[PDB]
Design a binder for this molecule. Structure first.
Ligand SMILES: Nc1nc2nccnc2c(=O)[nH]1
Ligand SMILES: Nc1nc2nccnc2c(=O)[nH]1
Ligand SMILES: Nc1nc2nccnc2c(=O)[nH]1
Ligand SMILES: Nc1nc2nccnc2c(=O)[nH]1
Ligand SMILES: Nc1nc2nccnc2c(=O)[nH]1
Ligand SMILES: Nc1nc2nccnc2c(=O)[nH]1
Ligand SMILES: [Zn+2]
Ligand SMILES: [Zn+2]
Ligand SMILES: [Zn+2]
Ligand SMILES: [Zn+2]
Ligand SMILES: [Zn+2]
Ligand SMILES: [Zn+2]
Lengths: 163, 163, 163, 163, 163, 163
């Protein structure tokens, strides 16, 4: 067989989100980004001439991005935020006693500790593998999946999993 | 004399901000963008060989961007937001009764009606002309100033003023 | 009022097509391109804070592109091609007696003389104005529409209409 | 010694071709692309200060691209196309009985099964190594050659060989 | 008739040159740039379907660039440089008594006062019109020629002539 | 733990320098480039949610670039240049007896043999590790550092060190 590595990357694989960084002894102000996601994978070229169809990769990256897009990204497991449910809002209180409140529907609660590029990348990697489907990946011989997330064109984090 | 048109554009001329769109009968969710600003100008080439030094354009675009960067962009003159001062926060209430609250220091209050690309462009154009200095522009023979603001690589608004 | 100029441009505004150039005393070989379309317009900023919503521009550029995408572009009005209907194919004969045949369904017949970037740009401009809708443009105060078509990143043609 | 990895990539390393995808139970329509080729290699920095001269890499990528450019890409080993020689044309018949005919001189017959990005990448990799010359590569200490082919900016396949 | 505007722009339209800025009361250090040139023109679409063939524009931009490429750019008409011919070198003395010497063959003497982007743009515009040929432009109905020169991706000057 | 790989890359990580290539039996003319530097690193995501803060990477890449920027790059260890100190200049004599002279302050003397992209990359890699600080990198768990240097957008060299 012949190994090939596929890359899909596009201005469409975007989610335009608000967030703020907080960790021990530090809190940044609320702001936002046009995050962008690329996906790279490795498998053998199949009898149909593809490792896996690009169209499916594009469909599923778009799907995951679309869930995050146009929301405030809210970590679930942060040790430095107090996240309160107040009526139909999340009220967030930082260690410096700064306070924020957002409609719950404007927020996407993600099982991460920090809304950093790195942790968001790991989350997306796990979601992309679920959406494309792990058994389906293995039928295509895919053995490696890698996600790059950029928070702006100049700063990216890349994570992978051997499958 | 010889007319020349200068363009300065860069990933540095950025402000990474949160905002949300609201106008009559419409409210989007809180989200964010890596806004980018380019500046174009026209004047005659001076005896020193420049219309105006690129370094000054870069310094001042960076300065204006830096004031907006890492904040929630809050319009001052919106007819569809109720903006309340609560302790050290701005509490914002929309026509659909959605409610937000942010530390005032996380917000940049801008004399616009909507945090649209177009209105933000007009605001930046006016600020850039103040920062570079209008009399200084006229000493360099500059007669045209134009700002492009992008909210993402695929959507830009451009405004100008004849001076 | 305040004039603003909007630009929408994206790798999505694409149509990946085959074509070949033929004009008097010249015929190139069959080949293809990832054509890309940008749209620029001018109007006044409306009470909602937009000249016109970017989402509608993106929707309609995508629509026009999608009709052309994945087809052979066939001119209707060429003076140097003999275009024959043979069963469910178009058979095309050039002045040098070169012959081609394609399934009609693989072809998009366009009311142009040459599949040049310039003529394709004029065709798209006319189609985009129909799709977005001319009366709707005038309600938004749009007075200028301009299309750029690229046949590769290094060669573009731009056409406009005052409306 | 010191390992270095060289990358050459450029809008010039292009071939603007028509093709169509066909494999069992599937046929797309005729269309085209601005394919782009990048080359990456690894060797030790030589006493002249280069792993290998960039100019030679650029010359040979251009050469291989130029053979494919402005042609229909025709696979030789497809199990789902019937490729007939008719006078000075290739007549191609698909499993759904769709029929195409092209002048042979407009076609480039390539020893692949599918005109997919992956198979085209393997073909180019093999050709680039022949053109630059394998013994010449080994005199420069090059031990790794890798080709990326893009069919559009958003979809790429990458193949390599250890030499 | 139909007006169209053509743009050609490419990483190939490059000249990698050394220069330094000097004007009254100012001298920068010797350094260099990958200058890039784009050309924009306006004419009517001709009976062959082109305003003018892109290939000719590309050929001639490459030609002009190639004359400047890999040289020190030496102004002829500077009021602040003393340019001496010493054996087979140019010895250049600045107002601060700084001194440089280069082989004449490493230098390209250009009829400008300052090696600024603006003056280099005017020079290239004049050369491009000579190379493509003014009478030939008028046979194609071209009435406007415009050159953009960038000294780096973030700083460009644009000059034009109505013809 | 979770491995992540960070990339920082930007038009700001630039140094606009003059240089010329000389090695045995070869000398190019004086010219220049907008060199660009990217940095890639690998470590584990720390309890603060970062492998290492992007801001520190950006600060230090800028610092190293800034030392080289706006100078002639002068190798220290070339076997084919005769480098003489003459008053406040370096006079450089090549094997073909070509002669150059530059103010010492316009030159940056770098401990390399050739001003090639590869050797400049190794030098920058070593400097970046010193500037960010090796012990500080190891506190962040960083185990891999990699620098890419481009002399123009189309030609790059990449070097790394396991730490
Ligand atoms: N490593 C890293 N650094 C950062 N610095 C500032 C903002 N975000 C980030 C981020 O998400 N990751
Ligand atoms: N015209 C325009 N349209 C938009 N659509 C969605 C979000 N923002 C915008 C915006 O800022 N301007
Ligand atoms: N002006 C122009 N020139 C061209 N040259 C070659 C191929 N296509 C074209 C084209 O579409 N337009
Ligand atoms: N993997 C892969 N997928 C594709 N999907 C559509 C068209 N071409 C392709 C192609 O060439 N490769
Ligand atoms: N306007 C202008 N400004 C500059 N600043 C620094 C270096 N070059 C330039 C230049 O060429 N033009
Ligand atoms: N490999 C390599 N080749 C080159 N060719 C020309 C100029 N510089 C270079 C260079 O710096 N590296
Ligand atoms: Zn952020
Ligand atoms: Zn928005
Ligand atoms: Zn073509
Ligand atoms: Zn295709
Ligand atoms: Zn310079
Ligand atoms: Zn060089």
């Amino acid at each position: 067989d012949q190994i090939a590595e596929l890359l899909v990357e596009s201005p469409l694989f975007s989610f335009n989100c608000a967030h703020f960084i907080a960790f021990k002894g530090f809190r940044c102000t609320l702001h936002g980004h046009n995050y962008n996601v690329s996906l790279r994978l490795r498998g053998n070229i199949q009898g149909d001439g593809y490792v896996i169809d690009f169209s499916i990769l594009k469909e599923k990256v778009r799907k995951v991005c679309k869930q995050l897009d146009h929301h405030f990204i809210l970590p679930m497991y942060s040790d430095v935020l107090n996240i309160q449910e107040v009526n139909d809002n999340f009220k967030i209180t930082c260690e410096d006693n700064s306070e924020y409140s957002f409609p719950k529907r404007d927020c996407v609660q993600i099982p991460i500790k920090h809304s950093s590029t790195e942790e968001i990348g790991l989350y997306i990697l796990n979601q992309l593998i679920e959406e494309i489907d792990l058994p389906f990946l293995k039928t295509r011989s895919v053995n490696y999946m890698e996600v790059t997330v950029s928070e702006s064109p100049s700063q990216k984090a890349t994570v992978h999993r051997n499958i």
